[PDB]
């Protein structure tokens, strides 16, 4: 912790202090969901973590829809960069 | 969310009347300013003032009690709700309590009361009643 | 009454404090209640944790 977030921020920062950055939030949610699935592949019975992952995925989907409705160029760029297929 | 500013404005005013308060604070939208000025010129309110601040702007309303203990605005009620819109024509413009009250109606040419709309031969959203 | 941790401004109990845990635990060994010890809820929870760890590390008895 405190390394993956900083790296993703430095990578997806459009401005010097751009931290809202729907793209940054999406990247953070993606990495968190991946880290969560890493341990869910073993502790299959942790349903509360599954609910948290569902919440994160809902946030991700809402952000993706907003970005697509706002700027399709940046939406496609984020797609090509992250591979969120 | 809140789904509408106007209905909450009217209900806040109604609660203020019930409690016999003297002031209020509202985000003061343009239509709210218009309704407040209409009520002012209609004698329902003592005085109204606008407070344009940085956040959004605020408006203060001073409830009126002309006599010992009497509520000028006995009751309010909204009609054109967000989901059931009401549009009235010039010939169907209603009158509140045989012309005793007043109902606000946004028309093709500015926001006007029932009598003003009847005189100008217009119609539109019946967005509130007053008794 | 008056609490001890607040009066002393102390920090994490540092369960090693066998004398403090002793004087805060009943003579029999049972954990004294909050209404008698005068401590706050947070300090009482930390006290329970510390006394349990101590009992686990043979620093205080289970039965007497």
């Amino acid at each position: 912790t405190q390394e993956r977030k900083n790296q993703l921020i430095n990578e997806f920062k459009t401005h010097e202090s751009d931290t809202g950055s729907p793209e940054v939030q999406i990247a953070i949610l993606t990495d968190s969901i991946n880290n969560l699935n890493e341990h869910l592949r073993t502790h299959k019975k942790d349903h509360h973590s599954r609910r948290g992952l569902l919440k994160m995925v809902g946030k991700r989907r809402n952000l993706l829809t907003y970005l697509r409705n706002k700027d399709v160029t940046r939406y496609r760029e984020l797609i090509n960069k992250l591979g969120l297929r | 969310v809140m789904t509408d500013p106007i209905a909450d404005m009217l209900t806040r005013i109604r609660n203020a009347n019930m409690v016999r308060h003297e002031k209020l604070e509202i985000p003061a939208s343009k239509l709210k300013r218009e309704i407040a000025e209409i009520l002012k010129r209609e004698g329902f309110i003592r005085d109204v003032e606008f407070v344009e601040d940085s956040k959004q702007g605020i408006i203060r309303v001073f409830l009126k009690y002309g006599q010992n203990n009497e509520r000028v605005i006995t009751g309010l009620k909204r009609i054109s709700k967000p989901g059931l819109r009401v549009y009235a024509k010039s010939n169907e413009v209603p009158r509140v309590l045989n012309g005793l009250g007043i109902a606000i109606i946004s028309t093709s040419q500015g926001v006007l009361t029932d009598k003003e709309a009847r005189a100008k031969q217009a119609g539109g959203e019946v967005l509130a009643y007053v008794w | 009454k008056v609490c001890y941790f607040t009066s002393n401004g102390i920090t994490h109990i540092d369960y090693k404090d066998v004398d403090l845990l002793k004087k805060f635990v009943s003579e029999r060994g049972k954990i004294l209640p909050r209404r008698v010890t005068g401590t706050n809820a947070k300090y009482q929870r930390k006290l329970t944790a510390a006394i349990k760890r101590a009992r686990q590390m043979a620093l205080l008895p289970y039965v007497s």
């Binding site: - | 004698g43 000028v72 045989n98 005793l100 | -």
Partner: protein, 164 residues
């Protein structure tokens, strides 16, 4: 304010219900009297009374109603505006009518409106048909009425400025 009872009144009863109180010996029967007292010039009142006899209960109800009179506007022999009373699950609406319609209401509301001096009113009960609650809701609706001149004085405007 309280209206004085020194006026000519057309006291008229509505119903007399017989109640019973249970005791070791048995049921004790008492009579409950409902009466509406008022004049046809815009003043009326409601009262009730209880006693082991019919005439005594009637007298008590009349005496109580005398102390509970109320004034009602008489704009054009009718009401200035429509209104509804909602006293205790009893909903009754009252609409103004033309000069030739007449009083239209169920027994108690009709009696109250007649004894009040109003001749042309449209009514309809939308709740329980209990006479006590009917009378209470009618009285409440009549009390919540407002006069044109009173409203003009209150809102700092002229009568014509409101009527047109």
């Amino acid at each position: 304010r309280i209206d004085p009872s020194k006026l000519e009144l057309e006291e008229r009863l509505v119903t007399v219900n017989r109640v019973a109180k249970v005791v070791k010996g048995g049921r004790r029967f008492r009579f409950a009297a409902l009466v509406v007292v008022g004049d046809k010039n815009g003043h009326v009142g409601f009262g009730t009374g209880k006693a082991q006899e019919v005439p005594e209960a009637i007298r008590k109800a009349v005496e109580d109603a005398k102390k509970n009179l109320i004034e009602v506007p008489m704009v054009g022999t009718t009401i200035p505006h429509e209104i509804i009373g909602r006293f205790g699950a009893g909903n009754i609406l009252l609409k103004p009518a033309s000069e030739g319609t007449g009083v239209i209401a169920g027994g108690p509301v009709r009696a109250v409106l007649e004894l009040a001096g109003v001749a042309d009113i449209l009514s309809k009960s939308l709740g329980s048909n209990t006479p006590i609650n009917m009378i209470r809701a009618t009285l409440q609706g009549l009390s919540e009425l407002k006069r044109a001149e009173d409203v003009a004085k209150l809102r700092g405007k002229s009568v014509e400025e409101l009527l047109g």
